[PDB]
Design an enzyme around this catalytic site. Structure first.
Site, PDB file in Angstrom:
ATOM      1  CB  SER A 145      -1.116   0.181   0.891  1.00  0.00           C
ATOM      2  OG  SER A 145      -1.868   1.077   0.909  1.00  0.00           O
ATOM      3  CG  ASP A 241      -5.828  -1.673  -4.820  1.00  0.00           C
ATOM      4  OD1 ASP A 241      -4.935  -2.571  -4.104  1.00  0.00           O
ATOM      5  OD2 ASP A 241      -5.899  -0.203  -4.660  1.00  0.00           O
ATOM      6  CG  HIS A 287      -5.687  -2.445  -0.380  1.00  0.00           C
ATOM      7  ND1 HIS A 287      -5.107  -2.032  -1.813  1.00  0.00           N
ATOM      8  CD2 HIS A 287      -4.842  -1.394   0.370  1.00  0.00           C
ATOM      9  CE1 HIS A 287      -4.584  -0.499  -0.983  1.00  0.00           C
ATOM     10  NE2 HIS A 287      -4.297  -1.386   0.267  1.00  0.00           N
TER      11      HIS A 287
END
Ligand SMILES: CC(=O)Nc1ccc(Nc2ccccc2)cc1
Ligand SMILES: *[C@@H]1O[C@H](CO)[C@@H](O)[C@H](O)[C@H]1NC(C)=O
Length: 341
Positions: A145, A241, A287
């Site tokens: 991330s 995502d 994610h």
């Protein structure tokens, strides 16, 4: 378990001035080193950094960190959980600078918070050299991330740092997980512009020179900064995502308009990876992946992510039966049966 070390240089700090640090599990018989950058969004002005300090304080301060962490996924030392690099030296760098690992600003006279993410990475590398990184032959900078975007912003600076310290033999590489975003049309940019000024954020020099003063925010987008990079970088990105869809104002009886939007997002992401030779992109709504215990389960075209990374290592020494560019072509989430449940 990886054990905590707070930085010996206490001028390199988390947001609230407390020392930054790293968790380390070393592997004597190994000359490979994995440095992982944690994620966790970011803050970009006084009032929303204050909010983060009340309810996400471990992402802004080290005063409450535990003395140990368990290594999971690619940070696991067990070959059943980590077929790729189970014997490597393992480093987890906590994210406590709220600046997508880009800041170089001290706490001060005129600054309520310190934003030192780029300097934290540099200091960890410097102090690790005295603990065995001087003997290394590969340094993989990885992250998920905001940590994945941080890999893209910092991998070449780490390579430059080791070259100038006198270590030209250490091969620096990057692994960016779930940090490859699109500045697309929403379904229904000021935050990042507005944070780089608040952080004194730094971006890689070649990308800075292309976009120039005031437009450095462009270098936080993978498809724009990746072509300027020189170190080898492997890109992992789910085609659908969840962080991307959140910022796009999508919340999942899907009618025609949303169907076309979702299908277009997939195809656009697929397009930006066509010239990325080392990449892994499944048609899933998810994610992050690389420090999840079940990261071994997903497959594209029959190849798992740990296998693809092993093929990447072999390529850096076309390979028969050991591919490195793996991007799904089916156009809807979940259309790959191996997606996370
Ligand atoms: C037209 C336009 O400017 N679109 C746009 C710009 C920036 C983002 N930023 C973003 C994306 C994914 C994840 C976190 C942030 C998203 C969409
Ligand atoms: C500690 O870090 C700061 C900021 O990077 C740097 O200016 C200073 O020289 C460092 N101190 C030592 C002894 O390396």
């Amino acid at each position: 378990d990886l054990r905590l070390h707070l930085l010996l240089n206490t001028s390199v700090t988390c947001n609230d001035g407390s020392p930054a640090g790293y968790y380390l599990k070393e592997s004597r018989g190994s000359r490979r080193w994995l440095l992982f950058l944690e994620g966790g969004w970011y803050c970009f002005n006084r009032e929303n950094c204050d909010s983060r300090y009340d309810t996400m304080r471990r992402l802004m301060s080290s005063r409450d960190w535990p003395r140990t962490r368990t290594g999971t996924g690619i940070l696991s030392s067990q070959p059943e959980e980590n077929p790729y690099w189970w014997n490597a030296n393992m480093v987890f760098i906590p994210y406590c600078s709220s600046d997508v690992w880009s800041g170089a600003s001290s706490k001060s006279e005129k600054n309520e918070y310190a934003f030192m993410g780029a300097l934290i990475i540099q200091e960890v590398v410097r102090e690790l050299l005295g603990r065995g990184l001087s003997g290394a032959k590969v340094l993989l900078l990885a992250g998920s991330s905001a940590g994945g975007t941080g890999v893209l912003l910092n991998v070449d600076r780490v390579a430059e740092q080791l070259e100038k310290l006198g270590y030209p033999a250490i091969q620096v590489r990057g692994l960016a997980d779930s940090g490859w975003f699109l500045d697309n049309k929403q379904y229904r940019t000021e935050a990042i512009r507005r944070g780089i000024r608040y952080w004194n954020g730094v971006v890689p020099e070649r990308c800075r020179r292309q976009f120039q003063e005031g437009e450095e925010w462009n270098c936080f987008f993978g498809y724009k900064v990746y072509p300027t990079l020189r170190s080898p970088v492997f890109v992992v990105q789910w085609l659908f995502d969840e962080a991307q869809l959140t910022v796009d104002n999508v919340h999942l009886p899907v009618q025609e308009g949303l169907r076309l939007y979702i299908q277009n997002l997939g195809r656009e992401l697929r397009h930006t990876l066509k010239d990325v030779p080392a990449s892994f992109a499944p048609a899933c709504l998810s994610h992050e992946i690389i420090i999840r215990s079940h990261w071994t389960d997903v497959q594209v075209k029959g190849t798992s992510l740990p296998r693809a990374l092993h093929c990447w290592d072999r390529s850096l020494h076309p390979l028969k039966g050991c591919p490195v560019h793996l991007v799904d072509s089916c156009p809807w989430p979940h259309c790959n049966p191996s997606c996370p449940t």
